Design a protein around this ligand. Structure first.
Ligand SMILES: NC(=O)C1=CN([C@@H]2O[C@H](COP(=O)(O)OP(=O)(O)OC[C@H]3O[C@@H](n4cnc5c(N)ncnc54)[C@H](OP(=O)(O)O)[C@@H]3O)[C@@H](O)[C@H]2O)C=CC1
Ligand SMILES: NC(=O)C1=CN([C@@H]2O[C@H](COP(=O)(O)OP(=O)(O)OC[C@H]3O[C@@H](n4cnc5c(N)ncnc54)[C@H](OP(=O)(O)O)[C@@H]3O)[C@@H](O)[C@H]2O)C=CC1
Ligand SMILES: O=C(O)CCC(=O)C(=O)O
Ligand SMILES: O=C(O)CCC(=O)C(=O)O
Ligand SMILES: [Ca+2]
Ligand SMILES: [Ca+2]
Ligand SMILES: [Cl-]
Ligand SMILES: [Cl-]
Lengths: 415, 411
């Protein structure tokens, strides 16, 4: 340790990303940065041991210290309950953290010049602004055991009326039902975040919904975005030769896929979750994407790997087999978190370290040292040989050596 | 015409697809086929005039005659109501028809050997099996005007205790809320048709859900699929060296995009809607995709163009400007419908015509006669010149001339 890093909230995760997370801290961060680290173990077992309280504590720590960096975590279903003998099917820690913090999760591919894409046309970045709040991640779903009536009701706080809507009358057998919601103020912040990102990047903005089907639910998003655009951003967009357009989600994915990129894509929570993997995979690999929750206040951020815990690679690791899991997304959670930390504290030295590690990461890959997923982008997966990539530790170790070099050269300047 | 086709339910549509729809009948179908056509005008105007009853009437007719062919239609929102002076924001006719018929909507790209793909790896087809029933198309959504409590309740029909769940307490301001549902029996049919499709085509089957998040709702899909697979199809899949696997939706789309294709993709209603256009565009163009609703009974079918009314092109046809709109999907609604009509009636000569017209369509494009969209797949849109494609009316004529030759040669 040497650089004064400041207060950072660290959230440890599960399976293969937990392995990578420790290597990142051991080989890339702690040798060069001293941190007032507020660590919360969001491993599935410690969440289970604290009845998921540790997750809530972590989110509140992020509000207090303004910078969070999170490792990928298991969201358990019935299979996971059996695997770890869990007490309950705990809720997604990301859902919990995102709805406590609110805001927009901006996601963007991490691009290296030597990594071919699956979508050849994407010569410019696509940035998804994913609404962090509401919808499926806060839904209330249940099994309908048999015939009966499902209704959804609204009662104003003053209790002067009650509106009851019929969802469905199950006449023969049961099934499933769910309710979900969103809030105006959150949608408004989501809109402001989306318009400001497009102006910051100088690119057009597109919002996707399905308002032809969900005329009230999605129509609200469409209406709030439009009212804010016409009233506070159309002039600035027109001044920068950019524009805002609402599109039906299904037409948006097709247009995005045949475009050349270079636009901000405001997505509802569920769509941003799914399409950000469409985008990440289209540029090359799920391992090559940044994901930063930006709250409305502007001062608090949570950086994360958007991909999962890579269970399949972890199973190989458990058997002693060689893995080649891409750590770039996990590394950029740290760099994006520390960069925001540096901005808040006017820490020029930490700002340099953060950008230097991002540069090292891209320079290492562009020099031909990469994990198997990226080697498969260059060649074809059926043509990849072992000599074409580095295993998980080898790649981390190469990054470590290149980081030591770049930081050593930085000290050889006149100071 | 002189080919006895039989009874067919027609559903006319809106805007650009309505123009193409009549050109297909006047030039590709009627000249050669005589059939008892039960026409229902699902144009936005007639739907408004009949308070959408024509849509429901058309759905019931399909259940009676077993084969329907549907043109793309407008699903009106606010801006559409102002456009046509509508009485109400009529529900999507597709949602209406699909929930009345139920079943699974199987969507597959229409492949031509000379049209490059956006996803280079997709050398084998991807067949999406989209659950036709429930979910967003039957949801109940509303605006929450201010602070208050939204709750969802289940009152069992057996008199036992009512179950109430809190959806959200709005404390500061309002927002939106919605309820949706699905039925076990429909999910069971959706699963059976997915496993049967995979076995008939000889490809593995994937089901996508977000059951880690919707643990009960999506878990029900996952459990029902797995139950039926283990009890009724696992041995058959192993016999054909294929497999069934559940994947989280975001993993699925990423796995699909880097795959070589060649699998059946079972989607919930919403995912199938979005990802079918992902698949269609990835193979080349939204105009090159078939969409057929297969009812559970297996003997009833509704064929359609998966894509919409191509509104942007219609604003050019209204301004007298040349357009190049791909009619192949609309044509294949007829051929897939007439084909199933022939399978039911054991009509060997109608089946030949249906298959002949599909071949003519693909042979014409593979000979270099195509609409602008397919020219863009080859040369890239920034490099497309007028000589590289045929406008909508020129392309329909080239197809009809190739059909007259394909058939007459058959004699
Ligand atoms: N906290 C979070 O942000 C998220 C957590 N999860 C959780 O992760 C667990 C596993 O989810 P799963 O659906 O398997 O999704 P993952 O994203 O963990 O993995 C799916 C596949 O994507 C590829 N992949 C993803 N990340 C990388 C990487 N860094 N390097 C190389 N390949 C990568 C691998 O493909 P291949 O097998 O072809 O090598 C992997 O098998 C679940 O418990 C889920 O709840 C899931 C998503 C997000
Ligand atoms: N009947 C149905 O199942 C559907 C109905 N609709 C309805 O259609 C209307 C328009 O919907 P929208 O979101 O614009 O989607 P569309 O599918 O109608 O059009 C979106 C874009 O896709 C491309 N495209 C689609 N079909 C073709 C084709 N046959 N040939 C060439 N290009 C094609 C065009 O791209 P480009 O502009 O780049 O040329 C077009 O602008 C709405 O009223 C909607 O409700 C929508 C979807 C399905
Ligand atoms: O939290 C989860 O279980 C999944 C999260 C996810 O997939 C995403 O953030 O894109
Ligand atoms: O009916 C609608 O409005 C949308 C239909 C659609 O896009 C689909 O079938 O995928
Ligand atoms: Ca995701
Ligand atoms: Ca669609
Ligand atoms: Cl905040
Ligand atoms: Cl039926």
């Amino acid at each position: 340790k040497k650089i004064s890093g400041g207060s950072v909230v660290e959230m440890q995760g599960d399976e293969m990303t937990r392995i990578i997370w420790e290597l990142i801290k051991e080989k890339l961060i702690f040798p060069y940065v001293e941190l007032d680290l507020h660590s919360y173990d969001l491993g599935i077992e410690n969440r289970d041991a604290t009845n998921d309280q540790v997750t809530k504590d972590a989110a509140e720590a992020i509000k207090k210290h303004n910078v969070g960096v999170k490792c990928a975590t298991i969201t358990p279903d019935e299979k996971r309950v059996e695997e770890f003998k869990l007490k309950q099917m705990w809720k997604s820690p990301n859902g919990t953290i995102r709805n406590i913090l609110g805001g927009t999760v901006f996601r963007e591919a991490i691009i290296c010049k030597n990594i071919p894409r699956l979508v050849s046309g994407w010569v410019k970045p696509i940035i998804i602004g994913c609404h962090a709040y509401g919808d499926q991640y806060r839904a209330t779903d249940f099994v309908v055991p048999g015939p009966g009536k499902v209704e959804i009701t609204y009662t104003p706080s003053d209790g002067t009326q009650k509106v009851t809507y019929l969802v469905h009358n199950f006449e023969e057998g049961g099934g499933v039902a769910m309710g979900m919601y969103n809030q105006d103020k959150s949608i408004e912040d989501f809109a402001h975040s989306s318009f400001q990102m497009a102006l910051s990047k100088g690119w057009p903005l597109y919002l996707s919904t399905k308002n032809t089907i969900l005329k009230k639910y999605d129509g609200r998003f469409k209406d709030i975005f439009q009212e804010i655009y016409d009233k506070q951003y159309k002039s600035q967009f027109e001044a920068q030769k950019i524009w805002y357009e609402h599109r039906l989600i299904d037409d948006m994915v097709a247009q995005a896929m045949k475009s050349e990129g270079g636009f901000i894509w405001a997505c509802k929570n569920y769509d941003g979750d799914v399409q950000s993997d469409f985008v990440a995979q289209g540029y090359g690999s799920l391992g090559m994407m940044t994901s930063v929750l930006v709250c409305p206040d502007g001062k608090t951020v949570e950086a994360e790997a958007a991909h999962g815990t890579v269970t399949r690679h972890y199973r190989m690791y458990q058997k002693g087999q060689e893995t080649s899991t891409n750590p770039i997304a996990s590394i950029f959670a740290w760099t994006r978190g520390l960069a925001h930390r540096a901005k808040l504290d006017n820490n020029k030295e930490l700002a340099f370290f953060a950008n230097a590690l991002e540069e090292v990461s891209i320079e290492t890959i562009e020099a031909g040292f990469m994990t198997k997923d990226l080697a498969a982008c260059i060649k074809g997966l059926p043509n990849v040989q072992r000599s074409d990539y580095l295993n998980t530790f080898e790649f981390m170790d190469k990054l470590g050596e290149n980081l030591k070099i770049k930081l050593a050269q930085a000290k050889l300047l006149e100071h």
